Structures are given as C-alpha cells and as structure tokens.
Amino acid sequence: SADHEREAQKAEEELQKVLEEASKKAVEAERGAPGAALISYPDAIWWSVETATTVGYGDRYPVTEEGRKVAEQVMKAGIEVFALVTAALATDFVRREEERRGH
Amino acid sequence: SADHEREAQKAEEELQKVLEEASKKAVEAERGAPGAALISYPDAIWWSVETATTVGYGDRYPVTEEGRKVAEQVMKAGIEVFALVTAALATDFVRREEERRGH
Amino acid sequence: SADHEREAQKAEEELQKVLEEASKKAVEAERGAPGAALISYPDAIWWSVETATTVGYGDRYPVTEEGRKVAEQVMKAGIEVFALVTAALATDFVRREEERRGH
Amino acid sequence: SADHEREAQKAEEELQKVLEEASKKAVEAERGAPGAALISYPDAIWWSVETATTVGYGDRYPVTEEGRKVAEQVMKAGIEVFALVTAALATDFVRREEERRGH
C-alpha cells in the first residue's frame, strides 16, 4: 500500500472501534425507552453495523429518552472516516502523470 | 490555525441553524397535513437532526402539505455543508508535498 | 464568478429535468403494476424529489414491474449532478495559494 | 478518450458483477433466518441494485443470520467504485489550466 493509502486504511480501522462502543450504548440507549425496540446485546451489535456505513435502512433505532444522539454520534463518526479517504482520491488522477512516462 | 479549517467549522454551525429553523417550520408545516406523525417542538428538533444527514434512519417523515420542500431544503443544506468542508480535505493530499521538503 | 460555479449551477437544473420525467413515468410505472401504492398525479411529483437527492425516504416504494430502474435511474442522476460539482469543490483550497500572495 | 473515464467506467462494471454474486447470497442468506423478508430469487437482484446505490429506499431488509455482512458488503462495494470515480471528477478543476490557455 502507498503512504496515502495507509492513512485511509488506518481511518477505516478507527471506524470499527466506534461500532464496538455503538453496540454497547445501543443496549442501554434502549433499555428504559418508550416504544423501545433495540434489545439484547448479541443483536445490538448487528444494528451497529447497519448505520456507520451511512446507510440507515431502519431495522432498529434509538428513541429520545436514550439520547437519540446515540445513533447520530455513531453515524457521524463514519462520515469523517469515509470523508478523510479523500486524501487518497485527489491523488487517484494525479498518478496519470506518472503513468504517462511510467515513472 | 490554517485558514481552510476554520471555514469548514463555520459551515457546520450553519447546518445547526437550519435545523433550529427547520424545527419551527417543521411543526407548523405538519399542522394541517394528513398522516403528519410529526408534531411538537421538543421532538421537532429530533426529527430535524436525522433529516440534515438525509439518513432519516426510520424515525419519522413529513407529508405533502408540509411543503415537502421543507425537508428538501434541510436535506440539501446538510449535503452542501458536508461537501464544502472539502476545502480542507482537498488539501489533505497536498500536504504530502510539504512533507517531502520537511518544512 | 468562477467558471466552475456556473458550470455546477447548470448541472443542478439538469437534476430537475429528470424529476419532471420521473414524476410522469412513475405514475404509469406504478399505475397498473401489482403492489403499487404511488398512483395519483399531483402526488407523483412530490415523490420525485427527495428521491433524487438519495435519502430513500421517497415516502413510497416501487415494485419490479414499474421497472425499478425508474427510481434507480433517478437516484443515479442525482449522484452525477452532485458529484460533478466536485470540481468547484476542489478549487476551494486552491484559492489559498492566492491568499498567500494576496493576489 | 480520457483514461480517467476508462478507469471510472471500468469500476462500474465490477459493481454489476458483485450484485449478481451478492444477489445469489442475499436470497440464500435470508433463507434460514428468522423473520426473513427477502425470500425472492428473481427479485433478489432488484433489492441488491438499490443496495449498491446505498439507499435501501424501504423495500426489504436483511435479518441477522443472513450474515448482515452480505448486505453490508454490497454497500461498500458500491462506495469504492463510485468513490474511485472521484479521480476523473477531482481532475475536473485541473482541466481549467488547458481551458485557460484556450487549447
């Protein structure tokens, strides 16, 4: 991997760490909410997966008394990580010059 | 500290302003709309937060009488904000050149 | 104004064109297909809005007969338009170079 | 014919291949899971198509035994290919230099 590519890879790993925290706060961010739906720790992790990828299909979601920000904060983490990889995108075309002479 | 970083932070503040304004109109927009499902100022901001992210997740959703344009404005506002910050991400790759010099 | 702003602005108008065509085909694509729930002409236009800017909260759900491609194509068109302006977004930081010299 | 378009266009081709392979897994993955909703085979690709566009819309949703990773894999696959196109797009502002000269 390239220097810039390594940075993007590092950012991806950071997102995974957040999911672990999301899976937890998710259990508590429901146990005691009006109309709750996200219960159980084994299933709470799965919900965490479908959200950090900026894809809120639905399935399960936090209420209000459970700091709705629980999901918002987790999702935002993904935006920054997937947004940083840009440093590796703006260089995607730049290589065209190297490809010209095969540098 | 830099000059593009501050501009990016300012854009984030603008998004929050819209959400606050969205909550006001959002509630009023619903008042009179069928199947609104969205009412009350205290929960108006809650639905507004997911709207800016365009994620929506699956909490609520406006109707047609509430001038759907109400969401379109908020959803579009969020997308533009998370895009302008590119001014600080488009320079991420450029830093590689500065590192080469070591100054 | 920058030649990128005017170019990006033009792209926005192109997105609206698809919605107009989508508002129609959507009625027919849904009017006559099984499991359809779109129908209605004044309601079809409203659906053809938030869908373009992704979101997925079109407030509806097309089946298969309605040539899902009806919505798929609409959503994709938004990505191209929203992704095209990316050019104007890049030149964002580039302006910093001029700030250094104050030119 | 702009090498950037060839690379970007090529990425889209790989996206279609994933949907075909993923579609067969989605239906199979959904089978055997509790509360399965995606039991369709011919329409399995249809759901996969919207999945690659990272939207979900609101047609169907994977369970937990369907190795949610199945749906998650398609979403990431779409982001990579589309995100890569950022190359030709990021190079959009660069062309300004040629336009500035007039040839």
Helix (H, G, I), strand (E, B) or coil at B28: helix
Residue B44's H or E segment, with its range, is: helix B41-52
Does D4 contact A93 at a Cβ distance shorter than 8 Å?
A: yes
Joined tokens for residue A38: 């996200």
Q: What is the DSSP letter of C33?
A: B
Pick the closest to residue C71 from C81, C60, C82 (CA basis): C60
Residue B21's H or E segment, with its range, is: helix B4-30
**Residue A8: its chain D contacts at CB < 8 A?**
none
Name the method of structure determination: NMR
Pick the closest to residue D66 from B55, C68, A25, A59 (CA basis): A59
User: What are the residue boundaries of the structural domains of chain C, listed by start?
Assistant: 1-103
| Alpha helices (runs of H) in A1-103, residue ranges in sequence order | 3-28, 41-49, 69-84, 95-101
Whole-angstrom Cα distance, residue C63 to residue C75? 16
Q: Residue C33: what are its φ and ψ, rounded to 5°?
A: -90, 150
Whole-angstrom Cα distance, residue D103 to residue D89? 20
Looking at domain B1-103, which CATH architecture does it have? Orthogonal Bundle (1.10)
**Residue D83: its chain A contacts at CB < 8 A?**
85, 89
Contact status of A85 with chain B (Cβ, < 8 Å): no
The residue whose two tokens read 């730049």 is A94
CB C89 within 8 A of CB C23: no
Choose among C57, C85, C90: nearest Cβ to B56.
Answer: C57
Give the count of beta carbons closer than 10 Å to the beta carbon of residue B8. 18
DSSP code string of D11-67: HHHHHHHHHHHHHHHHHHHHTTSTT-----STTHHHHHHHHHTT--TTS----STTT
Whole-angstrom Cα distance, residue C67 to residue C56? 17
**Dihedral, CA of residue C12, residue A80, residue A59 and residue B28, to nearest 10:** -50
Residue D34: left (phi > 0), alpha (psi -120 to 50), or beta? beta
Whole-angstrom Cα distance, residue C52 to residue C97? 36
Question: Could you tell me which chains touch chain A, where touching means 3 or more CB pairs under 8 A?
Answer: B, D
After which residues is chain C discontinuous, taking C to N > 2.5 Å? none
**Residue B56: its chain A contacts at CB < 8 A?**
56
Contact status of B90 with chain C (Cβ, < 8 Å): yes
CB B12 within 8 A of CB B81: yes
Helix (H, G, I), strand (E, B) or coil at C31: strand
Contacts 24+ apart (CB under 8 A), A40-49: A43/D64, A45/A19, A46/D64, A46/D68, A47/A23, A48/A19, A48/A20, A48/A22, A48/A23, A48/A74, A49/A19, A49/D68, A49/D69, A49/D72
**Dihedral, CA of residue A87, residue A47, residue A60 and residue D72, to nearest 10:** 60
Longest CA–CA separation in chain D, Å? 64
Choose among B57, B92, B96: nearest Cβ to A61.
Answer: B57
Joined tokens for residue C54: 């992704």
